[PDB]
Design a protein around this ligand. Structure first.
Ligand SMILES: [Mg+2]
Ligand SMILES: [Mg+2]
Ligand SMILES: [Mg+2]
Ligand SMILES: [Mg+2]
Ligand SMILES: [Mg+2]
Ligand SMILES: [Mg+2]
Ligand SMILES: [Mg+2]
Ligand SMILES: [Mg+2]
Ligand SMILES: [Mg+2]
Ligand SMILES: [Mg+2]
Ligand SMILES: [Zn+2]
Lengths: 85, 184, 59, 71, 85, 141
RNA sequence: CUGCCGAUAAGGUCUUCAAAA
RNA sequence: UAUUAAUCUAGAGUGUGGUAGGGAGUUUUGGAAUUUCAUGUGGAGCGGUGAAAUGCGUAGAUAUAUGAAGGAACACCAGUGGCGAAGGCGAAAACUUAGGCCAUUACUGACGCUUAGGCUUGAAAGUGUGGGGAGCAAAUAGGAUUAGAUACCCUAGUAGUCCACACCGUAAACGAUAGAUACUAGCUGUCGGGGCGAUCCCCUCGGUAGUGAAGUUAACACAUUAAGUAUCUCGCCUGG
């Protein structure tokens, strides 16, 4: 499992901000990275595929939201995370 | 994690077996914590496996990374001196989080103390234990619950506007319809 | 399913062996004819309900 | 006649955990005279425990501690 | 008009002059039943039995055949309606 | 006034209140609670003026961040309500806008029609008096 | 306590009615 | 109502703290039982049926005892049960991994529901390539029954049932009941978390069942897990 503590501390805008959108997307990208490895290794586990697709879709909707409101932080978030492409 | 191997070595001679367990231990376990070992003893196992009727049961209480299993597992079969081997990861058995939870451990100690008290009175030295109460029901409710009972979070609200209130109270339902009998 | 005769009497051995054989005969006859997995589950639920309902009124 | 003394022991004791080399003699009572895991009516444990003892007992029967079909 | 001694298991709509009371105790029933009879006897101009009376004359006994037990049991005589197939 | 239960409400504000009133009437319940909104507050004010409910009290939390209105129904002595049937016109999706010439009369004036033209919610008769119409919330009779 | 055991041309009546006594 | 400029947490998510699971995939391991073969004892049937006959058997069968090989499925536990969105999931272990319930003085601050098109999964049968094949058995052969039997019964019996990788995308895929949200008597069970502390039992929050009034229905019946009072969105129906 991923060391959730380290990734959240990196993405915090300020302390105790453990429930924003930025911390959510950093955690989501980490889970996506881990799950692509696991699914590529196995290739026959389809519930994990269900989790991977659900997490990808959830991340996409939240980033759309962060574009609709406070677009400048969307530019900041995309260059660090490199999630677009 | 915390693992637990139960190794089954053949029935040859004691001193030389312990060395076999030590050899099987020091070879594998790439990364490991303290390796406490026991020795359940000599028992005649139920079904004969590997045409052997006696075996020495060893228990290892080490702890370490997930890589400690693969090499040891693949060498156990090869070793003619080992009959079986089980790596029971105690972090996944049927109940582990509660056992680490501190409050449940102390409650279990209290239950042990109290239950032992009941069994004693039943199997009284010689005087007859008339109640023989064990399986039967207990007495009245526990007064501990009645008091220490939780209080729901009664969110307090403050009135701001009102209108028409008069609290008439009309709690006179299913009232009598007939009143006084009469003649045409 | 070993049962000792005790060499005190004979009937008693057959009085216990009758019970043991009946529960034994149940599984022996179950693995004689092939039913679908759904039907096998169907028959298991059927036996449980019969035994349950009988025990309710005997308790 | 019968008895109403069928009550999960591990609940009264709050054992909370089953290990096959800590209560081995306890688990032999649950097993049948013909080495079978007695049902609820005989064993008396709550279903949750009835599941825990079964996994541990089947594990012991894998560890070659208790027979399969004979005494 | 119908009056009745409802005992917690009755539909209040059917009765008109409801008289909250027991119905299982051979003492409460008799006290209340005589009370309605007592109204009738006074209207008919014959002396009362229990109504408008002091302690010594209301005293009644508990029929034969610690405290009296007004518990409803015998639930085992209610199995599931015979079904199954 | 204190509570013990969580208070929830539907997203659609006219029929939420309407469902509460109709269920309480059918189930003979008297006191109900719901979340408070200004449209919901205004419609309840005109209802008590028309004599369909007895009391209507709006309340607020101790922090001034939430308000919930807890209203009671006006039952007579024999316990039969004054409301007979409720039906919502301007449902979500299809919003009903009728001019003054087509202002409805519910049960020949027996019921009341709620119309929020320009000055908040407003009864049909006074809407006719001002000769101005607009959004039609619900039919109450 | 489980053998065996198949078929049957077409179209058809019959409720007249309660006005009422 | 729509647009824009902002504030708040109750909707919905995140974290911490409790926690139940046959949830999934990959790799190993185990015992009964059937079949075949090997070695003993043994001596005339075994097998099958409504009754029999093909069939197997002095080349020593059936049976009995031991051993070896191999494949398939995982008794009891096992339920007036659990998990998953559905199909489905039940010998044991390791690794990887999905979702869910309860309490939150924490955080973001409407980020939510539905979903045409699109994508993913999807019982069994079937297909293509390469392995595997103990048992069973479509197709097929024979013996019966029968007026006839290409069927029900019996003896054999290939594909198939199994594995890996590629397709097929249909089922009474059913709770014959799309998803989401708020409200509406009660009683009896059972499962999980939490509070108390022998169990048992009491309360709270949820899942899964039975009974049951208002209410609904053409009736059967549903009835807090609605087919009840209402709203949103999608799919679908218009006589045989
Ligand atoms: Mg609004
Ligand atoms: Mg015949
Ligand atoms: Mg053998
Ligand atoms: Mg298939
Ligand atoms: Mg032929
Ligand atoms: Mg055959
Ligand atoms: Mg084929
Ligand atoms: Mg279809
Ligand atoms: Mg019903
Ligand atoms: Mg047509
Ligand atoms: Zn228990």
């Amino acid at each position: 499992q991923i060391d959730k503590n380290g990734i959240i501390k990196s993405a915090q805008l300020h302390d105790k901000d453990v429930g924003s959108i930025q911390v959510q997307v950093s955690l989501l990208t980490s889970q996506i990275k881990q799950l692509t490895d696991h699914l590529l290794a196995n290739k026959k586990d389809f519930i994990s595929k269900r989790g991977l697709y659900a997490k990808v879709s959830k991340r996409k909707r939240l980033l759309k939201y962060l574009k609709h409101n406070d677009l400048e932080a969307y530019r900041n978030l995309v260059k660090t995370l490199n999630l677009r492409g | 994690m915390q693992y637990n191997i139960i190794l089954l070595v053949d029935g040859s001679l004691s001193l030389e077996q312990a060395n076999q367990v030590n050899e099987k231990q020091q070879q594998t376990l790439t990364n490991v914590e303290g390796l406490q070992t026991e020795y359940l003893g000599l028992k005649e196992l139920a079904y004969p496996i590997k045409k052997q009727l006696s075996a020495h049961y060893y228990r290892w209480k080490f702890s370490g990374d997930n890589q400690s299993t693969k090499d040891f597992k693949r060498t156990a079969n090869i070793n003619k001196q080992v009959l079986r081997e089980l790596i029971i990861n105690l972090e996944r058995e049927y109940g582990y989080l509660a056992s680490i939870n501190p409050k449940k451990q102390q409650l279990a100690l209290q239950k042990r103390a109290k239950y032992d008290e009941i069994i004693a009175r039943e199997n009284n030295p010689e005087n007859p234990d008339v109640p023989v109460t064990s399986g039967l029901a207990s007495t009245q409710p526990r007064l501990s619950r009645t008091e220490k009972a939780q209080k729901p979070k009664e969110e307090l609200w403050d009135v701001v506007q009102k209108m028409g209130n008069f609290d008439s109270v009309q709690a006179n339902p299913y009232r009598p319809r007939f009143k006084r009998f009469n003649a045409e | 399913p070993k049962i000792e005769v005790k060499n005190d009497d004979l009937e008693l051995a057959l009085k216990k062996f009758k019970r043991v054989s009946l529960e034994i005969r149940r599984l022996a006859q179950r693995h004689e004819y092939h039913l679908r997995k759904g039907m096998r589950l169907r028959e298991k639920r059927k036996i449980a309900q019969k035994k349950r309902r009988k025990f309710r009124n005997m308790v | 006649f019968k008895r109403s003394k069928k009550y999960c022991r591990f609940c009264a004791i709050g054992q909370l955990r089953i290990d096959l080399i800590d209560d081995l003699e306890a688990l032999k009572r649950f097993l049948s005279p013909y080495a079978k895991i007695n049902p609820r009516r005989i064993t008396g444990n709550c279903q949750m425990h009835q599941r825990h003892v079964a996994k541990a007992l089947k594990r012991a029967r894998y560890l070659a501690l208790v027979p399969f079909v004979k005494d | 008009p119908v009056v009745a001694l409802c005992n917690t298991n009755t539909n209040p709509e059917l009765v008109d002059f409801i008289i909250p009371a027991n119905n299982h105790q051979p003492q409460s029933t008799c006290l209340l039943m005589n009370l309605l009879a007592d109204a009738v006897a006074e209207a008919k101009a014959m002396p009362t039995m229990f109504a408008y009376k002091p302690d010594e004359e209301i005293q009644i006994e508990i029929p034969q055949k610690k405290q009296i037990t007004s518990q409803r049991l015998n639930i085992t005589r209610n199995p599931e309606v015979l079904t199954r197939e | 006034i204190t509570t013990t239960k969580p208070i929830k409400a539907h997203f659609d504000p006219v029929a939420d209140l309407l469902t509460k009133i109709n269920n309480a009437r059918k189930a003979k319940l008297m006191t109900v609670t719901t979340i408070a909104s200004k449209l919901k507050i205004a419609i309840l004010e005109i209802l008590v003026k028309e004599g369909y409910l007895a009391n209507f009290q709006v309340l607020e939390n101790k922090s001034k961040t939430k308000r919930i209105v807890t209203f009671n129904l006006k039952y007579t002595q024999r316990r039969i309500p004054s409301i007979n049937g409720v039906k919502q016109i301007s449902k979500p999706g299809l919003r009903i806008y009728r001019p003054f010439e087509k202002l409805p009369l519910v049960l020949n004036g027996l019921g009341i029609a709620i119309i929020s033209t320009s000055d908040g919610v407003m009864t049909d008769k006074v809407a006719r008096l001002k000769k101005i119409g607009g959004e039609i919330l619900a039919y109450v009779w």
